[PDB]
Every structure is written in C-alpha cells, then in structure tokens.
Design a protein around this ligand. Structure first.
Ligand SMILES: CC(=O)Oc1ccc(/C=C/C(=O)NCCc2ccccc2)cc1OC(C)=O
Ligand SMILES: [Co+2]
Length: 166
C-alpha cells in the first residue's frame, strides 16, 4: 500500500530512529510499502522515518544502464553502521522529503557499511560514488539529519530563497 511521505520542515524528520529487533512479516510489509511508495514518487532512496516509521532501515534502488529501476537490485539495509569511510566529494542531492530542491553536499567518496537484510542476515558492503552517496544520505535520515542541514553558508540562503519561492 502507498504510504504518506513526510515533508520538511516536519519535526518528525528530526527523530532518531531505533534499531530493528524483530525481522517478521510485519517488518517485511513495511519494507514492501516503502518500496511501493518510493517508486510511485519516483525516488531512488527512502528511509523509514520519511513515512512515519522511526526504525533504522532504508531502501536504495539505483537505476541501471538502460536508466530503469529493477526491483532485483533494490538494497534493503537495516541497523546500518559505518565500518570505514574515506575520501571527499561534492554531489548534487535531492530528497522525497524536500521535493523541488537540489543542492551539492559534501560526502565521503567511499564507505564500507555493515547491516542486516530483511531476514536478519548480516552483510558488509563497500560503496563509492552514487551508491556511497545514497547510503550516507539515507543513513543521515535515521539520525534525523536532512541534506539541507549540510549546506554551506551560501547554498543555505539559496535554499531559503527557493523555499520562499514555492
Ligand atoms: C518536484 C520533484 O522533482 O520532486 C522530487 C524530488 C526528489 C525526488 C527523489 C529523491 C531521492 O530519491 N533521493 C534519494 C537519496 C539520494 C540523494 C543523492 C543522490 C542519490 C540518492 C523525487 C521527487 O518527486 C516527487 C514526486 O516527490
Ligand atoms: Co532523503
């Protein structure tokens, strides 16, 4: 089922999500609803709090060569934790909870994370570029952080201008 997407400046997006402890049918349905919700709004990443669920889980489904998304490559990361991070790069980001606004944010160009899939299986994943950016962006949501929070002095002003624009 489709779930309501929470938009900035809702205080709900500042929540610190909690670890998932029961990987059951209920959790799986929330993940399915999240995927259905992300696609319907044409996003490539979505954190649980963006739909009102203060849980430490998020999904990422980057499009392939053809430019289309295949539910097969969808990553479901629960209880993530950074093992290592390195480098630095700028990436223009967007967010379903801040529709209509896109701005460059500084991110690590490489990260290694540890997490669990929907079946509680432990995984270790190394990522770079786009995938590494999505991971950092989504994980920020779990800690109540939005990418507009990480904007430089100037860009923050541009955000306010464009915000007043809508
Ligand atoms: C008007 C407009 O274009 O609004 C949108 C803005 C962003 C998005 C999607 C953003 C998104 O998936 N971000 C994932 C996290 C990420 C950040 C940077 C690089 C990789 C991954 C969708 C929109 O469409 C609707 C219908 O709300
Ligand atoms: Co986001």
């Amino acid at each position: 089922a489709l779930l309501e997407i929470i938009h900035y400046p809702s205080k709900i997006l500042r929540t610190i999500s909690k670890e998932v402890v029961s990987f059951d049918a209920k959790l799986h349905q929330q993940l399915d609803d999240m995927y259905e919700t992300m696609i319907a709004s044409e996003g490539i990443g979505l954190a649980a709090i963006q739909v009102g669920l203060p849980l430490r889980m998020l999904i990422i489904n980057l499009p392939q060569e053809d430019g289309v998304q295949h539910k097969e490559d969808c990553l479901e990361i629960i209880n993530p934790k950074f093992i290592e991070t390195g480098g630095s790069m700028m990436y223009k980001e967007g967010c379903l909870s801040v529709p209509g606004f896109y701005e460059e944010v500084e991110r690590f160009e490489k990260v290694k994370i540890e997490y669990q899939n929907r079946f509680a299986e432990v995984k270790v994943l190394e990522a770079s570029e786009l995938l590494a950016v999505a991971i950092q962006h989504e994980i920020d949501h779990l800690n109540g952080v939005l990418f507009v929070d990480k904007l430089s002095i100037l860009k923050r002003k541009k955000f306010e201008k464009e915000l007043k624009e809508l």
